[PDB]
Amino acid sequence: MEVTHKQFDLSGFLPDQAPDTLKSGAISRGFNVKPTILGWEKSGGFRETNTAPTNEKDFIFFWSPAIGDNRWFSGGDKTVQQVEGNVVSDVSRTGGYTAAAAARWNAVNFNGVLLMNNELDSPQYLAASGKLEDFPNLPSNVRFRTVAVYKNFILGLGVNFGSGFLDDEIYWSHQADPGTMPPNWDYANAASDSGRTPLPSEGYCVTSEELGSMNIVYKSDSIWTMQLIGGQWIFRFENKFPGQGILNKKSVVSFEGKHFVVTQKDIIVHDGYQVRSVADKRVRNFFFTDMNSDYFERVFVVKDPRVAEVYVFYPSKNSVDGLCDRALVWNWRDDVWSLLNLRPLKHAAYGYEITGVSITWDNFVGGWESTGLWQADEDVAKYAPVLHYSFRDVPKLLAPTPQALFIDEEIEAVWEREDIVIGSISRDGVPYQDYERNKSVSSISFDVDTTEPFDVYIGYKGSLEDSVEWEFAGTVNPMEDKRLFCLLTAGLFSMRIISKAQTFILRSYKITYEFAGEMWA
Amino acid sequence: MEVTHKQFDLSGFLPDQAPDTLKSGAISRGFNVKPTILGWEKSGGFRETNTAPTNEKDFIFFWSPAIGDNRWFSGGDKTVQQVEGNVVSDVSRTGGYTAAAAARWNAVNFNGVLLMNNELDSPQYLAASGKLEDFPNLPSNVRFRTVAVYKNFILGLGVNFGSGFLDDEIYWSHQADPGTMPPNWDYANAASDSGRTPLPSEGYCVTSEELGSMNIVYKSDSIWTMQLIGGQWIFRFENKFPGQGILNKKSVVSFEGKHFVVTQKDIIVHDGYQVRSVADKRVRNFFFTDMNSDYFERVFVVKDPRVAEVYVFYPSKNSVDGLCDRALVWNWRDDVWSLLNLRPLKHAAYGYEITGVSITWDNFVGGWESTGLWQADEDVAKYAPVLHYSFRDVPKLLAPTPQALFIDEEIEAVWEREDIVIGSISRDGVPYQDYERNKSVSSISFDVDTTEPFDVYIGYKGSLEDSVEWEFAGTVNPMEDKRLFCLLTAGLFSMRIISKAQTFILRSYKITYEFAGEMWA
Amino acid sequence: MEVTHKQFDLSGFLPDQAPDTLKSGAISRGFNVKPTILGWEKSGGFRETNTAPTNEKDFIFFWSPAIGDNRWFSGGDKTVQQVEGNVVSDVSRTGGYTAAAAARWNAVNFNGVLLMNNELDSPQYLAASGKLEDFPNLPSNVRFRTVAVYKNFILGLGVNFGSGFLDDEIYWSHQADPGTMPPNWDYANAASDSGRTPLPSEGYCVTSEELGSMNIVYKSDSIWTMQLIGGQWIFRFENKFPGQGILNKKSVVSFEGKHFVVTQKDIIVHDGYQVRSVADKRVRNFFFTDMNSDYFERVFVVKDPRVAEVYVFYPSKNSVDGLCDRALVWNWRDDVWSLLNLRPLKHAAYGYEITGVSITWDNFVGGWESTGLWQADEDVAKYAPVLHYSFRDVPKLLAPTPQALFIDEEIEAVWEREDIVIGSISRDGVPYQDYERNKSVSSISFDVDTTEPFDVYIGYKGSLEDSVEWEFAGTVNPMEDKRLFCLLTAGLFSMRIISKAQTFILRSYKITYEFAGEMWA
Secondary structure, three states: OEEEEEOOOOOOEOOOOOHHHOOOOOEOEEEOEEEOOOOEEEOOOEEEOOOOOOOOOOEOOEEOOOOOOOEEOOEEOOEEOOEEOOEEOOOOOOOOOOOOOOOOEEEEEEOOEEEEEEOOOOOEEOOOOOOOEEOOOOOOOOOOOOOOEEOOEEOEEOOOOOOOOOOOOEEOOOOOEOOEOOOOOOOOOOOOOOOEOOOOOOOOOOOOOOOOOOOEEEEOOOEEEEOOOOOOOOOOOEEOOOOOOOOOOOOOOOOOOOEEEEOOOOEEEEOOOOEEEOOOOOOHHHHHHOOOOOOOOOOOEEEEOOOOEEEEEOOOOOOOOOOOOEEEEEEOOOOEEEEEEOOOEEEEEEOOOOOOOOOOOOOOOOOOOOOOOOOOOHHHOOOOOOEEEEEOOOOOOEEEOOOOEOOOOEOOEEEEEOOOOOEEEOOOOOEEEOOOOOEEEEEEEEEEOOOOOEEEEEEEEOOOOOOOEEEEEEEEOOOOOOEEEOOOEEOEEEEEEEEOOOOOOEEEEEEEEEEOOOOOO | OEEEEEOOOOOOEOOOOOHHHOOOOOEOEEEOEEEOOOOEEEOOOEEEOOOOOOOOOOEOOEEOOOOOOOEEOOEEOOEEOOEEOOEEOOOOOOOOOOOOOOOOEEEEEEOOEEEEEEOOOOOEEOOOOOOOEEOOOOOOOOOOOOOOEEOOEEOEEOOOOOOOOOOOOEEOOOOOEOOEOOOOOOOOOOOOOOOEOOOOOOOOOOOOOOOOOOOEEEEOOOEEEEOOOOOOOOOOOEEOOOOOOOOOOOOOOOOOOOEEEEOOOOEEEEOOOOEEEOOOOOOHHHHHHOOOOOOOOOOOEEEEOOOOEEEEEOOOOOOOOOOOOEEEEEEOOOOEEEEEEOOOEEEEEEOOOOOOOOOOOOOOOOOOOOOOOOOOOHHHOOOOOOEEEEEOOOOOOEEEOOOOEOOOOEOOEEEEEOOOOOEEEOOOOOEEEOOOOOEEEEEEEEEEOOOOOEEEEEEEEOOOOOOOEEEEEEEEOOOOOOEEEOOOEEOEEEEEEEEOOOOOOEEEEEEEEEEOOOOOO | OEEEEEOOOOOOEOOOOOHHHOOOOOEOEEEOEEEOOOOEEEOOOEEEOOOOOOOOOOEOOEEOOOOOOOEEOOEEOOEEOOEEOOEEOOOOOOOOOOOOOOOOEEEEEEOOEEEEEEOOOOOEEOOOOOOOEEOOOOOOOOOOOOOOEEOOEEOEEOOOOOOOOOOOOEEOOOOOEOOEOOOOOOOOOOOOOOOEOOOOOOOOOOOOOOOOOOOEEEEOOOEEEEOOOOOOOOOOOEEOOOOOOOOOOOOOOOOOOOEEEEOOOOEEEEOOOOEEEOOOOOOHHHHHHOOOOOOOOOOOEEEEOOOOEEEEEOOOOOOOOOOOOEEEEEEOOOOEEEEEEOOOEEEEEEOOOOOOOOOOOOOOOOOOOOOOOOOOOHHHOOOOOOEEEEEOOOOOOEEEOOOOEOOOOEOOEEEEEOOOOOEEEOOOOOEEEOOOOOEEEEEEEEEEOOOOOEEEEEEEEOOOOOOOEEEEEEEEOOOOOOEEEOOOEEOEEEEEEEEOOOOOOEEEEEEEEEEOOOOOO
């Protein structure tokens, strides 16, 4: 007359399924709790990092001119900045950058030279002068949307100079010299190798042609391929998948060995020859229907190289600034999903920070003793591409931290299984739930590795046709006790778990009950 | 002495099988109720869209000359129209178009230029003049049936000028310039690349050579292939499947990555190298034998990119206008079928509508404040190719809508399982029905997620050799009760379910009974 | 003490196996009853079609010079005829055709031109003159056995002019012009492309080199291949299977995507690279050993495109005219076999008939109202290649019809299972029969969907070593009763089922019994 259920069969965040038929350990509604091998885990807590922009932080990015160097650029209206040493700003173009640009620039990586492009301003590159400047032979009339990179070929982009912003692409480069754009770029002239191509299609090619060792591919609203093996006119215009179209610029595909693709319709994974949706029957519906984004853009996705996770920051209907305040998390190493809730945030990226006190040291002494070469610090994390989040409401940035505390306040956690498979247990170890038999609770006991307490709320419902109703039960510290007593009877069984704790480790649970009647209403 | 049966093993619309041996949840006779993952669903309800042709609507189509633009053309006798802004008509050819043409034109897509061809009139194209006009160097004597498209090669068609309408094809184009047909077309002259080819076959090549990234293929009554890799005379005439022939022009193959093919004999799926019927033992018989179409043409099929469904509009015998009034639905993501019943309808297509009030605004003010760029609206649905249906008996078009209501009246739903697998339940969880033992009903209870009531009808039959007879039972609102009581005994057990409701969610059901005798007659 | 057995596991016509060990639903002896998915079905009934030859009908064939046209040719001694409009005859060659030719001509299809060849007469082709005439430059001395077709290459045949009828082949054609044989044919002269080849082999190449998109292949008594990819002398003589030889000219391989091959030894299926017998342990023995054909030729096979069936008309020993009167039926979609019994018949083919009253209409009126373009009729069946059977004893032809009635008389049906697997039923659902225990009958009950009655005969046998003996039981109309009572005891159990009914639908049956002793003799 008892059922014990466990949470290490590694099911994902599964809200779209028929929630009553969910297998053991499946989650109905989640709040930023991480499903892991050992069990449910807390993935939260943030250290305060040393970077400081002292200005508007719309786009942030990490790059280095040499080993041991860490530089960052913060761009805003009229303004792009620097984050290095202890001084900022004064890298933006000569004039006021352009008319109140906001969340509409772009950043790309090509060799060691850093490149930035904006919708409203011509592309400027950074050189030894320290001032962003336009390309050498590119005529002034031009104005550009988005830029991209490829093998020794800079500016794999798709927008013309002006009056023709719709559907374009130009091989701006030639066989480039690593570290500088080609001395000329001429397309119509037959000096070397360059040209302009239509690439006919109904949709508008929007952003970079993505990645892949063998070749790079992307889409306007159906995927197109590029391969430079030919010699007559290099590259071969070709297409792959007509159906798939992409919704947003920053809805980018990942740099992982596999490609993580988000579309208007579904979420698909492929590498050029075979395709499949990453989660069709599990995640597709909730991701889109959580809200009509209604601000389609500003939805961006990054990677987490350290742990096999990828985060898609998405707006909440409740959210009104258009900021995501929420993020979809999927594990690429194993097919499990998770969902998070966070403070309002604007943009995010990964990188490293090495800051420490430097020029104020005590002994003016001679150069026969060791500096230690700027010794100490996250020397370990230099390999670790820790993420950096441009939180909307803080001047200083932060980075993730195992101890689930934001700065000094703590972040919430909620665990919800709307209904449980409870009832007759058949020949197989796993039970099957009988709807017809109404049932009474006896007791609850939880398997936890931590020591911090967690609160528990209990839900009840009359019939499946009826909705859900809520009740709260006082928490219990696991150190002294493992069980709680309550008496109730309903149609289906609901418990709601909330935790304000440093660490949460859920393993399994057991429920005692008895068949004492049948279904009425 | 009770059997509980569920409807989430995802069986399709299965009328052709031996209906008594159908597995749990299988449907005997369906009425536009959608089988889904969670359970049976209602797929109906229609919003009223903003388009208005003010004329006969035979063929409708969506195209755009630029991003942000939405245009539609409505063609009829003597007449083709425009749907844009707030004015219509005045696009048709200079003279009266041709002698009372009806449901006999055709539309194709090639680059951005829109092309229309009709059986009784020479092909006219639309240009900057806004008036459809004939091709530049095509001689006037010609008269054409159907046209098609391919890679940089317009007019992949198969009908000659006149007196030879039977079996033709001409490479009307050369290496075309995107946006305009080739400056000349000459086939016999050796100026460049063009020619006329027989493609011998018994049957008449009827329509477009279909699609496919690598190449396009189609049939007269056996499939033929085209591939332009060669250079001497480009293209290589070749064939693939002798057996398969197609019945109707608008019985087109889908644009999906796989090809959805309808034939005279069967319904087959392939992509060029391997073939198979989509549903041989399940759907083949009922689709054809529902009626001898007896108006073979006007049977058209479109796609639904949003949800993995395809609809084949087909006439009902009861229908006499030749209009389909019914549609066959199959899911391509998962092999499940469904069937719908609708009002009389003439033709359907997909597209988008962005209409709103514009030139009547209040403040005549200066251009320093933002229009908002025609702000608001289905900006979300701009990616969504929502279908548009040319209903026979309405001046304004409509689009599908989750709430199952047509405009203000509501659409019906009927669920029918003629016989149920009920009886001894063996070692396996699934039961097996015993014909020999006659049985008595006890009660019925239904698992439903909605709150709206649904009516229930009960059928009885003496022997399997005997037919079916019907009885009705009063509905019950699920909010207060889940069970109904009735007493009866027959050979096999029939229940008929009908619902006039906003939403219908069927999950499972249980039947209580008892073995109280054996079979008599 | 009861066994229920069903007939929807889809076993074929299986007379060769050890009949007692046959699984449930297997047939011992069949009479033209069709095994289908739902169960045993009647495949019989014939409508009277409009064609009328008014002469001897040996070979019949369907062809069309244009869309909408239906023409047939009936050939006999001295005579070949036409079937079109309302007049026949007067197409045969100028003189009396040849010396009492009978069942020894041949027909082939090449482009639109119809070709006929006979053993005793030179090949004549039909042209606009309406009179069959010899080939243009073919010298008169020639006399030919069989002719064939290939890609743009007419007359892929294997018999020389005269005095050398044994082993030949000539590439009579060149790159032909579609619609007319090549202007010359010369083989020895080096004007273009033609020649004579031995193709050494022990056996005599007898008939057409069969079909296949990639290439065509056939045999004298071991299979040979032809492929024209080479250029020096086109074609490459090659062979594939030494063992397989074919017995009769009209024992042709099918046009299906797979090849249906009948041999002297076995019945094999292949497509060029892999081979296998279609039914080795099931059908091989009975087909050959039903009778020594002893008239090897006149055994012909056609296809049924509509339903996946193929019919091999074969003589019965009882038959003495040499006419088949019987036909072997196998389903290609699923590996199930069936056997039929029919009236004496000479030859069969497929085609279409569109006949109706035409020139006798009432209103001599002007051409401003619609003929309707010869409106109405089997417009649906125009896609349907319905078979046409040259029954020996009727002037007018007939076509198959669902209602099992010949013209006004009805066709018989017999169902026979010589022994049933009856006895102990083990752990598995399927029973196993015990020979040692003699057993007594109790009752019989049959599952049928129809309403028409069927008669039942009961067989008994002492020991397996003993033969079978017969008894008859009165039929029962299924409408009122489903059971019959009889008392008997034997070694093994036999029931014989016969039906003179419009439609027969067998589903399953149950037998009640008791173990009441052991085996004696």
